[PDB]
Design a protein around this ligand. Structure first.
Ligand SMILES: *CC(=O)Nc1ccc(NC(=O)C*)cc1
Ligand SMILES: [Zn+2]
Lengths: 17, 375
């Protein structure tokens, strides 16, 4: 859902950069 | 290749940044007509223009910061392509388990253009660093990476067919009089056809000296049967926007993460929703198991989740709502095998075959290896 996507997106960016 | 996921990611980003175009393209959609507007506007663009800044316009709304409006458009369109009226996809198991291309998709006369569009869209997500939730399978990702689907992959999409091929592999078919030939049948839209698995397969009987080649070709045929043209249209649409060769070094699990984003794994929820077979929550190996999981960072935990369930995606309800190929199926750990074995999984059942190892150190070592190296 949108909440989970915000999390998936932000956690990915933080892991990478 | 053997380098970290983060390293491969930045190499891929450097390829994307090194090939970006300036200015922008506008994609204007209404929410009621999301798919149709997205499909017309994107397919009416030269594919390289989709590497420009994306200006997504929800007709009649706010604006402000584009990171969040980008994510909403990518997320919603990734669900909308699944809409059954389009006849593009179907599910191998019950309750939308295991997405795959519909072999009858040609009932939609535009379906090849629809698949090309989905290719462009998925490439756009990768190119622009945005995430989707369509639910493609790990073997679908293998195809994008020119990795051949394995025998073990079959167990994820089609448990019986896998068991059927395993049986042939492990047993002497001449002893049981099993009559097989290098041909297969397929019915799509009520029109049954015959594919030869190699030249003259029609007459070539399967023997003990033939078996390994038969298993291989049959495996290839199960993954490609009836969806060749759809799959090629997807791949050419992706490749038009982002060359598929830029996806080198990734394995299919990393590519899934690239497209889905990164799920934080709640160790509490995981443990509260795990069921056991022969084991109990107090068995030594189960306790060693959760201590290994606590010691894992989030990347390894995701890797394990993919190893056991076949995907990094958790349902919105968490580990309680986890689905298998025959209905709801909670994460399950089963005492199977010898300590000389590696842990093994059955993704269709969300099951980990954990052998009764004799030491935390042995279990930890084999578990970390299996997650990293096997499937
Ligand atoms: C829901 C959720 O957990 N979101 C979230 C946002 C940001 C990060 N970022 C970093 O850790 C740097 C993690 C999780
Ligand atoms: Zn699963």
């Amino acid at each position: 859902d949108p909440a989970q996507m915000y999390c998936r997106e932000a956690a990915f960016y933080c892991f990478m950069h | 290749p053997d380098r970290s996921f983060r390293w491969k990611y930045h190499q891929f980003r450097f390829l994307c940044h090194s090939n970006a175009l300036p200015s922008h393209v506008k994609i204007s959609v209404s929410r009621q007509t999301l798919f149709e507007d997205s499909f017309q506007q994107i397919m009416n663009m030269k594919p390289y223009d989709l590497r420009r800044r994306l200006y997504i316009i929800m007709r009649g709304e706010e604006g402000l910061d584009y990171g969040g409006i980008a994510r909403e458009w990518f997320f919603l369109l990734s669900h909308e392509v699944l809409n059954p009226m389009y006849c593009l996809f179907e599910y191998a198991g019950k309750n939308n388990y295991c997405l795959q291309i519909n072999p009858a998709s040609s009932i939609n006369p535009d379906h090849l253009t629809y698949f090309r569009f989905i290719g462009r869209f998925i490439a756009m997500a990768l190119y622009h660093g945005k995430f989707i939730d369509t639910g493609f399978t790990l073997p679908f990702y293998k195809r994008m990476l020119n990795k051949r689907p394995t025998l073990k992959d079959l167990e994820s999409i089609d448990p019986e067919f896998y068991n059927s091929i395993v049986w042939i592999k492990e047993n002497n078919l001449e002893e049981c009089g099993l009559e097989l030939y290098f041909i297969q049948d397929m019915e799509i839209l009520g029109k049954v056809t015959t594919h030869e698995l190699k030249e003259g397969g029609e007459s070539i009987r399967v023997t003990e000296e033939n078996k390994e080649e038969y298993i291989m070709l049959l495996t290839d045929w199960r993954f490609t049967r009836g969806v060749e043209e759809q799959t090629k249209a997807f791949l050419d649409g992706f490749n038009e926007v982002a060359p598929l060769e830029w996806l080198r070094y990734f394995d299919e699990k990393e590519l899934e993460l690239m497209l889905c984003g990164m799920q934080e794994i709640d160790m509490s929820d995981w443990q509260k929703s795990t069921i056991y077979r022969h084991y109990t929550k107090n068995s030594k190996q189960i306790q060693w198991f959760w201590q290994v999981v606590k010691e894992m960072d989030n990347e390894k935990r995701i890797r394990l989740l993919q190893f056991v369930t076949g995907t990094c995606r958790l349902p919105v309800g968490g580990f309680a709502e986890l689905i298998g190929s025959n209905g709801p199926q909670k994460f399950c750990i089963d005492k199977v095998g010898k300590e000389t074995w590696l842990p093994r999984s059955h993704t269709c059942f969300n099951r980990l075959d954990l052998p009764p190892y004799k030491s935390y150190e042995q279990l930890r070592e084999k578990l970390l290896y299996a997650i990293e190296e096997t499937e």
